[PDB]
C-alpha cells in the first residue's frame, strides 16, 4: 500500500531485517519528561 516512509522512524535491529533504511537525517536519543515545580517565594516583611 506504500512505497516509502517519510516520518520520524528510529532504526533498530528488528526493523532492519525486513525493510531497508538510509543514512539518518536526525541524530537524537531517548529522554524523560516530567512536570516542573512551583518556584515560590519567601519574602514578605523585613522582620524575616
Amino acid at each position: 500500500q506504500a512505497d516509502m516512509i517519510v516520518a520520524p522512524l528510529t532504526i533498530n535491529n528488528e526493523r532492519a531485517q525486513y525493510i531497508e533504511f538510509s543514512k539518518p537525517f536526525k541524530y537524537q536519543g531517548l529522554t524523560i519528561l516530567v512536570k516542573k515545580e512551583i518556584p515560590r517565594s519567601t519574602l514578605d516583611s523585613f522582620m524575616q
Partner: protein, 98 residues
C-alpha cells in the same frame, strides 16, 4: 582551532585546570558519524550492519564510552571561578558621573 567534534570533546574533558572549552557547549555543524569502509559491492555489509545495531540494543556501546571516553573536567558547568573587576567591567559607574 577547527576540527572534528569527536576528538575536541575528549581533549577538553581530559585537560587539567579546565582551561579549554568548546564553543556552543558541544555544538556540531556537519553531522556525519564514523563507519567501516568495506569494499564496494561486498557481501559482508549486511551482516556487519546487523551486528552493530545489535550492540545498541544490549547497551554494550555505553559501557565502551564509559570505559574509554570519560572525562573529569566539568566544563558543562558555567560557574566561573570568581572574577576580577576592571575598567571595562566597571565602566557604567564612571559614565554615571559622566
Amino acid at each position: 582551532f577547527i576540527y572534528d567534534a569527536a576528538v575536541l570533546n575528549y581533549m577538553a574533558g581530559r585537560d587539567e585546570g579546565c582551561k579549554l572549552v568548546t564553543i556552543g557547549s558541544g555544538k556540531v555543524f556537519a553531522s556525519t558519524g564514523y563507519g567501516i569502509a568495506i569494499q564496494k559491492d561486498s557481501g559482508w555489509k549486511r551482516q556487519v550492519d546487523l551486528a552493530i545495531l545489535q550492540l545498541f540494543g544490549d547497551g554494550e556501546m555505553e559501557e565502551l564510552e564509559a570505559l574509554w571516553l570519560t572525562g573529569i573536567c566539568h566544563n558543562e558547568k558555567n560557574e566561573v571561578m570568581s572574577s576580577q573587576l576592571d575598567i571595562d567591567n566597571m565602566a557604567g559607574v564612571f559614565y554615571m558621573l559622566g
